[PDB]
Structure 1
């Protein structure tokens, strides 16, 4: 049994679990009884129950015994839209709610209990959320999040009763293909994860940030860029005075409408000038004074007029507008509409307390809950303890100027709070690192937004962590991929029924070539070409946030580096990410030995170009025109929706194998040879036929005395091995030195490398 009742769950229950006589045990005999409209919401619970009870017979059905889910509108006043009652009796479990959202949250509580013990104590509890929006900002912006990551993230949020995610992202545009710079998302891909969110009660709100931070949309559209008095544009800012540019944005709004089901639209409205001055663009002031009919209209007025126009437009679609609070500026002939939700993050401009007093609905998008890959925030550096343990902190505490905190007193106008996940540099961290980084903060934010504060039985953060965070494992359905399909080793890489893949400087469809896969702690792979001694990477091409976003970008060979470390929190010791992470690859089991190969941070698939693919990156980028079209047979990276190319990765078949090891690992210049390292190279016969006349050829290297002559082994039988040694001594060379030995047997050729430090 789980005793004390409900002391090991997140969020904690908001009222006490009343104990009753007896218990109830989940077995493979139970059923999840639920109405058909709730089938999709119950599927997660069904799958978890089968995981928990180590079987596969549990189903969701409209009749049966076990766990009953009842949706009863009559309970709307007592439970609200998200409250539930959980009842456990010897006879079974009953979850009651007024709507789907609340019943689902009930299944999360139930699952977390069964996650710890199959036998549950009898009793009942009513659980209700303190705030209506319990949120995350996910900037899938400029850089990309793999669809698998998002699917896992929806599971992460769902199990914690988080119900709101703002996803700043690019949806592949049908009408404006010239603006489809990667990152973008397939429409079907978004429909898929938006559908999962609907089943889990998660409100997915899209964001196209405007009228600033629009580099991703206007790079290839100079005519919609705001221009200086000298006529110079800048893809960062949309010309809000141009009619076709407003039409362009509004078309994007429409395009998003067909895949997002939310009632909200977030136009961003980060400060338009981004630190510049409106006077450098007098056509904004002139547009303002024309549209208001007032001569005293300012540039900030035009910014607010834009905000209001988009407000009316989304309102005509029955939607509600959302903006960041730093988009609320001082005006003259235009006043900001009041039916817009304000997400407050910056301690500047109109105070959040006065905004709430004036009727605005507020989200606490608190800067203390920020995550970034480039410059880590305090919550990453130190964990949430400095907030949890701060009794002057809570959902109702917003940030103010000069480090002051402001308690918004009209709490009823506070919708809730959210944490924020920003990239800033797409290669400093991988997405799987991000997924580890937010673990504690997701639980903390879930706790304070559902409960309205800390659990009463966890005085300090250390207690919350020991009794809850460390005890509540994730749902067994969180993980959705084989994180290490292939073990570390030597493999061949080729197309299904085609040539193999080779790489020296550039990569190409070669033939007869070995690779070495080395798994990484964040569940990626390093692919080392064992002939060229260089690693497959992606570093050359058009970029956003130091990450290659050019479609069709050309993988290339790069010096192999250390890929054994992963970095979260403070990222202590995180150097070399510019080479490390472009070298890392996700390998997705495609069945039958085939594998989708996706770069870890550019998130595009290793592909064989066809000569028939089209994209803007093939013709121009940011006003500068240059043709990069891949020809048929060229090796490239491609978004998921422009390729089915998978890759056959299989352990090597070669009949000969060579291994070279030196002794010592360090060598020093020597006139008697005492610092001379002897590199023993040993050849091994893998298959079943006597190999003869095996030639081992040593390398030749600047500043080293190496035995010049090759050695030959007369015979080696199947499953045997033979050994020959060459001596190396440095002269004026110092530092790391790779030694490549060539082994040739008949038509077959392989190499063996060794490393020696010259001191």
Structure 2
């Protein structure tokens, strides 16, 4: 006698071949429903099966009812069989993998010019410029429905859904069809990756392709250390390139290790690093603003960032951390700092009193500034954000008080017309105060704080965000997922969340998100840059994008997957390393200053050579020698030294000064994480982050956490020469190495 053991012994009837309905397993004393498939587009809740052009695996699971209990089943892989009417060309290797492919006859060679018909004006313009970048040929947009080489068209009906697409290649041209304009955009990514491998020709055949999961995401901690907008748009295009579509951005956070200031005689509430990256009218009675003072986003900048990411299929999800990680808020309202008992009293200043109604009032006001209409924009700043993340990971006080606050902030978003996302913490914070679940998204980041199984039964849509598997803390001893890309690529599946496993077809499973946390910042900051973590961010993407969009099994080895990542290269019109196209040098003998150069910024490795003479060095006045949006090369700083400021706002000093009134030969050597200075051939010093060096001065010993490496990556600015340089520049040379 089985007793909802039935579920792990079920017998799926044959499924015949090319059937229309999923046959159902029957067991005498039990009632058995269909929970769902991993490809809802192939086997729906109603059990109806869609045709396939190539044999595709689908994982179904069930609810077995017998006596008064249930349990959801294990996954059953059925494989929908296609009619093998033909066979032809092999499937093109794409990241992520194409689900279905029917090989065809021959090739479609491209002409000296390419024409494209597209009913989406903004999509068609995007597509054509990505085309010219990859091909080098020049691409024409034709009327939507005129005679063209590649024709994008919106198909009605079908199973594709908002992210599917039918890509068809014949030797008379290419025809991309989708149900929504968003799946048409993913079709371009597939076509562009092929054209990356064979720019002259694409094999004939039909490609039908679906994402297995709805939410394929990357969170970025843009609060503990700054990230310029230009970098975040490199991230949007690189995610779109691997068909990832969820950019979760932490807008406010603060330095974790407030103890470092306490144990050394300082006030963390007064010196710990905190940030709120969005522009805000909010200011405290003491005039202190909520918006971060070193780098922030204006409301229009952010509103435009969200619309840009939507053009490339990515939904930006902004997060406001409360009541924890809220040192930016408590600095406005010290009277709301939680005062109750707690387990690590040295980290109090970052905690809002979630029990105080005058705290929910404040958090609501901050939210409303972006959820309600903005006067200047004529619409909310978060107008294009369907999902807003309300934070709510932890509260040091009563568990019931946490639940009341969690329910307040989740419902605030629901009543303002927004879907909320929350860090799963209800297992850690159980209680009788009801917390809303229907309409609410939850990040399953830790199993001790929220069990995946009890999250789905309480009624949440869940996102695999598991810390042991998907957290990256750059250059840290713990949370180094960037050294496990091989294991992720081979074993990681979205429905296994820590040591729990959901069925891949559970409808409340949205997908998964990997996370980048910048813990070792402030008085621990090594000086690393958004450039310095690009390789692991982009490399985390190219692995997880396969396991999020594709089937449960990697189509190749990790080693083959990485040499395909190389053939396909960066995303169209995306140069995150500022590599130059030709390694010939740039030579300038300036006529007078400032000289305008108008060359692209140059990343490592490079060497800068200049013959110059400093005519004056008034004290306290900065002297910009090289300038571009990526940063400034400071001939003289406020302390008199040579150094530079990056576009992430971190400043660095070489510790050397230029002689006033002397001809000097200046060389600067740019390497990954090392920028070196040589004056007259002699080593003048190596760059050191100056941003948070104070405060930690007088800490003396017992600051075992001072940064032990000094990283100073510097993308060379090359737009204007000698902006505010009080001197002459005789000769200047830039050389990629």
TM-score by length of 1: 0.63
* Among 383, 387, 396, the residue aligned to 1:264: 387
Matched, 1:303 2:402: yes
Partner of 1:433: 532
Tell me which residue corresponds to 2:210. 128
1:502-532 superposed Cα distances (whole Å, 9 cap, x missing partner): 3595459996575735242338855667799
Structure 2 partner of 1:464:
561
1:484 paired to 2:602: yes
Alignment of 1:153-168 (within 5 A): 153-168=235-250
Counterpart in the other structure of 2:289: 178
1:559-617 per-position Cα deviation (integer Å, ceiling 9, x unaligned): xxxxxxxxxxxxxxxx9966733x54444333x436xxxxxxxxxxxxxxxxxxxxxxx
Show the 5 A alignment for 1:343-362: 343-362=443-462
> Is contact 2:488–2:544 with CA below 8 Å preserved after alignment?
no
Contact 2:428 2:448 in 1 (8 A): no
Whether 1:518 and 2:668 are equivalent positions in the alignment is yes
Between 154-163 and 255-264, report the one with greater CA deviation: 255-264
Q: SS where residue 30 of structure 1 aligns?
A: strand
Q: Helix, strand or coil for the counterpart of 2:310? A: helix
Separation (CA, whole Å) in 2 of partners of 1:410 and 1:432: 38
Name 1:560's counterpart in structure 2: none
Is 1:326 aligned with 2:425? yes
CA distance in 2, matches of 1:209, 1:44: 35
Q: How does 1:425-574 map to 2 (within 5 A)?
A: 425-426=520-521, 427-428=525-526, 429-456=528-555, 458=556, 460-466=557-563, 468-479=564-575, 481=578, 482-484=600-602, 487-490=607-610, 492=612, 494-495=623-624, 501-502=635-636, 506-507=640-641, 512=661, 516-522=666-672, 525-526=675-676, 533-534=684-685, 537-539=688-690, 541=692
**2-structure distance, mates of 1:11, 1:65:** 27
Residues 123-143 of structure 1 show CA distances to partners (whole Å, capped at 9, x for unaligned) of 111101100001101110121
Match of 2:710 among 568, 580, 585: 580
Conserved 8 A contact 1:362-1:416: yes
Q: CA deviation at 1:263?
A: 1.2
Matched ranges for 1:71-82 at <5 A: 71-72=154-155, 74-75=156-157, 77-82=158-163
Q: Structure 1 residues 223 and 537, CA, compared in 2 at 3 Å: closer, same or farther? A: same
User: How far apart in 2 are the matches of 1:157 and 1:320?
Assistant: 22
Give the aligned partner of residue 653 of structure 1: 730
CA pair 491-56 structure 1, distance change in 2 beyond 3 A: farther
- Whether 1:593 and 2:721 are equivalent positions in the alignment is yes
Distance of 1:648 and 1:46 partners within structure 2: 42
Q: Distance in 1 between matches of 2:473 and 2:451?
A: 25
* 1:654 Cα deviation from its structure 2 partner: 8.3
After superposition, where does 1:722-737 map in structure 2 within 5 Å?
none
Aligned to 1:247: 361
Aligned-residue offset at 1:86: 0.3
Report what 2:174 is aligned to.
Answer: 93
> In the alignment, is the contact (CA less than 8 A) between 1:28 and 1:57 conserved in 2?
no
Work out which of the residue numbers 106, 116, 119 in structure 1 matches 2:197: 116
Contact 1:503 1:536 in 2 (8 A): no
Contact 1:503-1:529 at 8 Å conserved across structures = no
CA distance in 2, matches of 1:350, 1:465: 34
Q: CA RMSD in A?
A: 3.7
Q: Which one scores higher on RCO, CA 8 angstroms, separation ≥ 6?
A: 2
CA contact (8 A) 2:114 2:137 kept: no
Unaligned runs of 5+ in 1: 279-298, 548-574, 595-645, 656-759
Which residue of 1 is the match for residue 117 of structure 2? 33
Give the secondary-structure state (helix, strand or coil) at the position aligned to 1:150. Answer: helix
Pairs within 5 Å for 1:186-201: 186-201=298-313
State the distance in 1 between where 2:316 and 2:687 align.
36
Aligned to 1:214: 326
Structure 1 counterpart of 2:47? none
**CA contact under 8 A between 1:19 and 1:122: conserved in structure 2?**
yes
Q: Which whole-Å CA distance do the structure 2 matches of 1:199 and 1:343 have between them?
A: 25
Closer/same/farther in 2, CA of residues 256 and 4 from structure 1, 3 Å limit? farther
CA contact (8 A) 1:28 1:58 kept: no
> Which of 396, 406, 424 is matched with 2:519 structurally?
424
Determine helix, strand or coil for the equivalent of 2:329.
helix
Alpha carbons 2:217, 2:514 under 8 Å: kept: yes
Q: Which has the larger radius of gyration?
A: 1
Q: In the alignment, is residue 383 of structure 1 matched against residue 484 of structure 2? A: yes
> Hey, what's the Cα distance between the residues in 2 that align with 1:501 and 1:464?
45
Q: Give the whole-Å Cα distance in 2 for the aligned partners of 1:516 and 1:576.
A: 31
Listed one character per residue, the Cα deviations across residues 688-713 of structure 1 (whole Å, up to 9, x for unaligned) are xxxxxxxxxxxxxxxxxxxxxxxxxx
Cα deviation, 1:640-665, whole Å, max 9, x if unaligned, reads: xxxxxx6569994289xxxxxxxxxx
1:540: how far off? 5.1
Q: What SS does the corresponding residue of 1:143 show, helix, strand or coil?
A: coil
2:107 maps to 1:23: yes
Change (3 A) 1:317 1:381: closer
Which residue number in structure 2 is paired with residue 238 of structure 1?
Answer: 352
Counterpart Cα distance in 2 of 1:112 and 1:232: 51
Deviation at 1:65? Answer: 1.2
Partner of 1:398: 497
Indicate conservation of the 8 Å contact 1:11/1:446, yes or no.
yes
Matches of 1:9 and 1:306, distance apart in 2: 45
Other structure's SS at 1:326 match: coil
How many residues are aligned here? Answer: 534
Q: For residues 422 and 232 of structure 1, do their structure 2 counterparts lie closer, same or farther at Cα, with a shift above 3 Å needed?
A: closer
* C-alpha contact 2:474 2:480 (8 A) present in aligned 1: no
Aligned to 1:703: none
**1:301 touches 1:334 (CA, 8 Å); kept in 2?**
yes
SS in 2 for 1:175: coil
Superposed displacement of residue 199, structure 1: 0.4
Give the superposition deviation at 1:337: 1.3
Match of 1:66 among 123, 132, 149: 149
Please report how far the alpha carbon of residue 541 of structure 1 lies from its aligned counterpart in structure 2 after TM superposition. 4.6
Deviation at 1:405, TM superposition (A): 4.1
- Tell me how far apart the structure 1 counterparts of residues 560 and 281 of structure 2 sit (CA, whole Å): 52
- Distance in structure 2 (CA, Å) of the matches to 1:6 and 1:188: 43
Instruction: Give the distance between the partners of 1:541 and 1:649, measured in 2 at CA.
Output: 28
